[PDB]
Design a protein around this ligand. Structure first.
Ligand SMILES: CCCCCCCCNC(=O)[C@H](Cc1ccc(OCc2ccc3ccccc3n2)cc1)NC(=O)[C@H]1CC[C@H](CN)CC1
Length: 246
């Protein structure tokens, strides 16, 4: 039973995390929860192959010990995990070598790929997501009064091209070429604390492609303050190299 990357078996709501909506369970089957050995959620991540999870380097910077971490796959509820959820210990950590905010976790065992646990697709190397492309972020981060705490949420965010995002009114030059921006400039919808390390995916014809890793922002969901994501396409060669070498 082979499953194509980026093709959920439960079609997502795509409601047009603060704002957005609670996802249909298992409609974002690459979303993982990165947890302490005691089962405390602290970051998201994205399954990109049965043995590999992509996350933000800042999620791992406190401990270089793989035993500090475990990965929860197939979940919908944060607290009361579903019976099919897989909990897999991390074997090795690989931080991006130029110190950008992206990292790989090699799992101690491959995840079992099912209709609820499926990898996201990687983008082509150096792909640029065009201004205004509609994408989605997912996670179990905080909700700032918008409902759904404790459940996996999604939010539709359009990409804001870097040259726009860097304007004074927005992020005032801070965004690097190895980052991208996404958000609604009227505010109200955004990734927030506890979402970092998770995916920003953009639908292309018949599948979702992982274009961003939730990284940072100036608060959550503020008007004129879109979130910043690591631009995954600038790291595909590095990611593929790590997977090939390990
Ligand atoms: C006492 C703090 C414990 C951390 C749990 C709260 C996690 C909340 N996460 C954040 O604040 C992360 C940063 C963060 C901080 C700490 C962190 O993990 C701490 C940690 C994690 C594992 C550890 C293992 C052994 C020892 C200490 C450890 N400490 C992970 C992520 N930033 C974000 O989620 C961003 C997402 C984009 C948004 C704008 N659109 C703004 C917020």
């Amino acid at each position: 039973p082979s499953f194509d990357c980026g093709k959920p078996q439960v079609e997502p709501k795509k409601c047009p995390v603060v704002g957005g909506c609670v996802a249909h369970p298992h409609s974002w089957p690459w979303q993982v929860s990165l947890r302490t050995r005691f089962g405390m959620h602290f970051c998201g991540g994205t399954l990109i192959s049965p043995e590999w999870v992509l996350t933000a380097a800042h999620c791992l910077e406190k401990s270089p010990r793989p035993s500090s971490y475990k990965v929860i796959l197939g979940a919908h509820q944060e607290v009361n995990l579903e019976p099919h959820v897989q909990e897999i210990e991390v074997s090795r950590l690989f931080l991006e070598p130029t110190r950008k905010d992206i990292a790989l976790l090699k799992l101690s065992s491959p995840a079992v790929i099912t209709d609820k646990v499926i990898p996201a697709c990687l983008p082509s190397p150096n792909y640029v997501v065009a201004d205004r492309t509609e994408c989605f972020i997912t996670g179990w981060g905080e909700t700032q009064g918008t409902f759904g705490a404790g459940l996996l949420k999604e939010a539709q965010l359009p990409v804001i091209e870097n040259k726009v995002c860097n304007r004074y009114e927005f992020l005032n030059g801070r965004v690097q070429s190895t980052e991208l921006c996404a958000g609604h400039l009227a505010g109200g919808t955004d990734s927030c604390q506890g979402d970092s390390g998770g995916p920003l995916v953009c639908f292309e014809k018949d599948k979702y492609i992982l274009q961003g890793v939730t990284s940072w922002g100036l608060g959550c969901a503020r008007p004129n303050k879109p979130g910043v994501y690591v631009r995954v396409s600038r790291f595909v060669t590095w990611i593929e190299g790590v997977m090939r070498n390990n």
